[PDB]
């Protein structure tokens, strides 16, 4: 008795996995080596951002099964392969229990170039849309009631740093704890602060030494906020302990990052040593030339550092901690190193959807 | 009560509203669907505009296949089979969002598209010719 009518322009979306263009802010004349990558892959940004707050609709977000981390990751690998040319590369190849692997070796002309991260937007093409969860107490997974349509995001900073988060975005209410599955003892725990911790970490005018200062009182209050938030998830009666590390390579057991075109490997033995129950700290950085690349399997040899002063000041905004679940008390050995975790903590509230504006409905219409 | 007119929620701004009120603002969501720098930056904008125009043209041609060219809302001749998640008209048009409707119809939508393509414009035609 009732028939079918088509409707054009209905507000529906489906979960898509398309590619995105960057559209960062490039100057097209600077030799930053981030800008020469940006001027050859990014279009200029939009000075009038579009933000449409939606009505009472709840969306099932997901953090650890996203499909923009793997699109960040290839772009940052392309940036590091087109920006910082190493002197000696060593990548295992291993052409096929009966197997033997040989290591290839290429030699490239290695200069010393400038290096500083620039803010990078991620903007979806026409037809698609980006949903942003505006909830200030987001667990990371599950449903979000306050969703909003955003044309594209804020400027993300492609920081390359294990063991600590540098120049990152901040939370709103308090320190937040994100994990895929607590009580698994294999998944990393991401911790986002609510205030930045200033760190000034520089090479004075021995060339392989660097003094790297952080404030003691702000770090103590930040660790107090961290232990106050961690006591909610474990029963509010368990004393926790911060160990330093447990073995591993030099690019995990310390805090490793880049400062002005040079690899800094600063120890963190003087930070995670306290035990919490119910003026400045200096760090011995050793600048390196033998590194293990985070992008692939292999080793890299670089140039001696530039004589002069190398100075960088930054904001510590987040932490990556790993529980040591045993047989009581618990220990949080801070590890990390998988670089997808260094971008999933700042791309944690975004979703890519595809509009399909063609619906069918039953009415009482005729002809 | 007293009133002044309609409001403008924005693009995709009525997804949380009911089906009986979001179908009156299809015009808004149908309107928005339509040297080194001269080599790099301009050609991406040109490709994006060409892609948007071509996507709109393909989708309008797909609407024009079923005899529904140009119009946002039009009626066809297939009947609503009761196996396609039957409900009352009041609860469909008053108590559902469009997202829940496409969650509840997505197992059968290709059959709807095939029945619309095979019938109507190939059944009103080839019968008017004889």
């Amino acid at each position, epitope marked *: 008795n009732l028939w079918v009518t088509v409707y054009y322009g209905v507000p529906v979306w489906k979960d898509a996995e398309t590619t995105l263009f960057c559209a960062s802010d490039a100057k097209a004349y600077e030799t930053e080596k981030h800008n020469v990558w940006a001027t050859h892959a990014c279009v200029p940004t939009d000075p009038n951002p579009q933000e449409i707050h939606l009505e009472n609709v709840t969306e099932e977000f997901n953090m650890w099964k996203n499909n923009m981390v793997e699109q960040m990751h290839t772009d940052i690998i392309s940036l590091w392969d087109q920006s910082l040319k190493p002197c000696v590369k060593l990548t295992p190849l291993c052409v096929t229990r009966l197997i033997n692997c040989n290591t290839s070796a290429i030699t490239q002309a290695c200069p010393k170039v400038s290096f500083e991260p620039i803010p990078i937007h991620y903007c979806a093409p026409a037809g698609f849309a980006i949903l942003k969860c*505006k909830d200030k107490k987001f667990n990371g997974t599950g449903p979000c009631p306050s969703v909003s349509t955003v044309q594209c995001t804020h400027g993300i900073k492609p920081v390359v740093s294990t063991q600590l988060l540098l120049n990152g975005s901040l939370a709103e209410e308090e320190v937040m704890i994100r994990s895929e599955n607590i009580t698994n003892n294999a998944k990393n725990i991401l911790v986002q602060f609510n205030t930045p911790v200033q760190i000034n970490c520089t090479r004075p005018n021995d060339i392989r030494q660097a003094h790297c200062n952080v404030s003691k009182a702000t770090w103590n209050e930040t660790l107090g906020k961290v232990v106050k938030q961690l006591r909610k998830h474990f029963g509010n009666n368990t004393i926790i302990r911060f160990a330093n590390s447990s073995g591993g390579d030099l690019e995990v057991t310390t805090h490793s990052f880049n400062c002005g075109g040079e690899f800094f490997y600063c120890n963190t033995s003087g930070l995670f040593n306290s035990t919490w129950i119910s003026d400045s700290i200096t760090l011995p950085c050793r600048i390196k030339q033998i590194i293990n690349m985070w992008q692939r399997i292999g080793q890299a040899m670089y140039a001696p550092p530039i004589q002069g002063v190398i100075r960088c000041v930054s904001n510590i905004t987040g932490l990556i901690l790993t529980r040591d679940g045993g047989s009581t008390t618990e220990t949080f050995r801070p590890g990390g190193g998988d670089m997808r975790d260094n971008w999933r903590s700042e791309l944690y509230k975004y979703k890519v959807v595809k509009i399909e504006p063609l619906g069918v409905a039953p009415t009482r219409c005729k002809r | 009560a007293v009133g002044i007119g309609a*409001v*403008f929620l924005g693009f995709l701004g009525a997804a949380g509203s009911t089906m009986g009120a979001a179908s009156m603002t299809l015009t808004v969501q149908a309107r928005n669907l339509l040297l080194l720098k001269l080599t790099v930056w301009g050609i991406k904008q040109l490709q994006a505009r060409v892609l948007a125009v071509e996507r709109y043209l393909r989708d309008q041609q797909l609407l024009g296949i079923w005899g529904c060219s140009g119009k946002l809302i039009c009626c066809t001749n297939v009947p609503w089979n009761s196996s396609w998640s039957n409900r009352n008209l009041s609860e469909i048009w008053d108590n559902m969002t469009w997202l829940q409707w496409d969650k509840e119809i997505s197992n059968y939508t290709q059959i709807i598209y095939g029945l619309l393509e095979e019938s109507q414009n190939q059944q009103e035609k080839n019968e008017q010719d004889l």
Partner: antibody
Amino acid sequence: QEVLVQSGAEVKKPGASVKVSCRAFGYTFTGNALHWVRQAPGQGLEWLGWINPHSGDTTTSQKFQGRVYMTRDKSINTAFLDVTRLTSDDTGIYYCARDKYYGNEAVGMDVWGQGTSVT
Amino acid sequence: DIQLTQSPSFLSASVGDKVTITCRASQGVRNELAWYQQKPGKAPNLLIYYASTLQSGVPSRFSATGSGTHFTLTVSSLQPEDFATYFCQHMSSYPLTFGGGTKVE
């Protein structure tokens, strides 16, 4: 999350005109009708007018036509209200209120400002 | 205009009482009147819209009834955070006007 941010308190002489702004956060400003209301100290609430932030049409009571004027700016999402020939009875606190606006009609005022003091 | 009279004006009550407050209109306004509360020094807060429906975030211990020109709200249990001024206002026809005030203590 949805809040209304205004300017500071103002002190003006009688016979002049006063200007108050109201900016929207957390929602699309062109989606809900906006009301303005005053409070003299120790009295009950009595109402000025209301405006659509999409069409720009204003509506005022039977005893303030030609007295207040309401405008809107969609670029900054700010609504402006101007009061002319100020007297001693207009001294009080100011509120801008988002109407809930269900079914294209007035329903209720849920989001309020923090009040602009005029004297 | 349309006149709204509250009844009674000033009240004294203890913690946990049953209280019913009344708003009367000069003309029939169906149900198009809403119930507000203003704390001293703060902006008014919305509690009841459409004279029978709870606003989201308002606790369930409040209620509101009424029809024609006779509307009431009822509080089942008084709390120390519930001591403020209660207002009633209609929107069936112009002007929009409010109640004269109902302070409870």
